[PDB]
Ligand SMILES: [Cl-]
């Protein structure tokens with residue numbers, strides 16, 4: 001298992017514009033297009049991202065391409081963030097993937113906001129961090145996915161994904 005596979009399971013793949021769990025326009029493997037309510041604004045963002053007049057539908061290769069970019073962006077944002085970087089640096093490979101997943105879903109800012117949990121992860125207090133991470137809107141809104149990510153942090157294995 002690896003980050004790409006992990007995220008492909010968490011996000012699925014849609015080749016036609018769709019609305020995510022929060023109601024925002026998305027496409028592909030979890031690629032958020034816009035938070036505006038306008039399908040047109042979404043279509044425009046899509047075209048601009050893809051580089052062609054898409055009519056709201058893309059190919060598998062187009063999706064995979066956005067996906068590669070988005071994962072690269074996530075890691076680079078972690079590495080550029082003063083709060084996230086030290087955490088990431090401290091973790092083993094599997095857990096690093098768990099952190100990228102959270103950033104991928106919620107954004108660097110969002111994750112940087114889990115101050116207390118981050119500190120716990122940094123300290124390697126797995127069980128405590130898992131409980132702290134559970135007390136969040138994130139967990140409450142997307143419990144199954146959150147559970148998978150949280151188990152990954154707790155255990156340091158891919159069990160939740162197999
Ligand atoms: Cl983009």
Ligand SMILES: [Cl-]
Nearest residue numbers: 142143144145
């Ligand atoms: Cl979920």
